[PDB]
Structures are given as C-alpha cells and as structure tokens.
Amino acid sequence: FQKCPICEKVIQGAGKLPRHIRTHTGEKPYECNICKVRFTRQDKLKVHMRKHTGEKPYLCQQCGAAFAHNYDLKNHMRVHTGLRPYQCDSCCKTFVRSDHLHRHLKKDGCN
DNA sequence: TGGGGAAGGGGCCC
DNA sequence: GGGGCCCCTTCCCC
Ligand SMILES: [Zn+2]
Ligand SMILES: [Zn+2]
Ligand SMILES: [Zn+2]
Ligand SMILES: [Zn+2]
DSSP states (O other), X not given: OEEOTTTOOEEOSGXXXXXXXXXXXXXXXXXXXXXOOEESSHHHHHHHHHHHHTOOOEEOSSSOOEESSHHHHHHHHIIIIIXXXXXXXXXXXXXXXXXXXXXXXXXXXXX
C-alpha cells in the first residue's frame, strides 16, 4: 500500500507507484521500434508487439480457434455460449458487454 | 445497439 | 524491489 504524493490516493503494489505517477504527466517513454509509436506502459507495448508479430497465444478450449488478445478470446467465448451475459434488474434487458450495462444504468434511468 | 481502441488499477511472482 | 505479465474494469467515439 502506497499513497500518491500528487493526488493523495492509495495505490496497491510497492512497484506500481511509478506507473500511477506517470499517468499525471503524459510521458510515454516506451516506444515501439517498428512503428515508432510511444506508449505509457510497457505491457501495452508488448501487446502492440503481438500485433506486429502476429502471434495468437489465446486458443479456444472448445474449438481451438486462436486469438491474439484476451478480449478477442472472450468475444469468441460469447459466440459459443456466453452471448448477452448481462441483464438489467430494473427493466429486464440483456446486454453484451459490461460497459453497455453501465451505459444503460446511466442513460436509461430506469431507477 | 455494437465494437474497436485506449486509459487506468490490481494480483502474482521474481 | 522495481517491474514484467497477466487479469480486470469503465470511457470515447464511430
Ligand atoms: Zn496520483
Ligand atoms: Zn509498432
Ligand atoms: Zn471457440
Ligand atoms: Zn434498464
């Protein structure tokens, strides 16, 4: 547990404090060597490296389809069985993604 | 109404 | 012991 001096906000993880402080500044030190695109976080750069490399480490356990990104894999999982897994309690409406539920819970104003 | 992309925080392990 | 590498979330916009 560490507290950010700039924002007085608790951040979990001893080594994660430099990452949060970088979010206040807008610096993007990590730069891809191929497309010369800068990213704020290293793990974001590695995902961009997957796009350049074309590797798909996420393989479906039901049909064997290979996808490059985790959310792409989860989208394929919803095609198999998980289509529309979110519901609105107030109005009884189904949704595909969790952000759409947040959009509905704010824009629709059922409550 | 749906999806791609990006921006953040957290857990595990070294 | 700062950090890679994975996970998760909501937001912006077409
Ligand atoms: Zn801060
Ligand atoms: Zn690149
Ligand atoms: Zn599949
Ligand atoms: Zn509703």
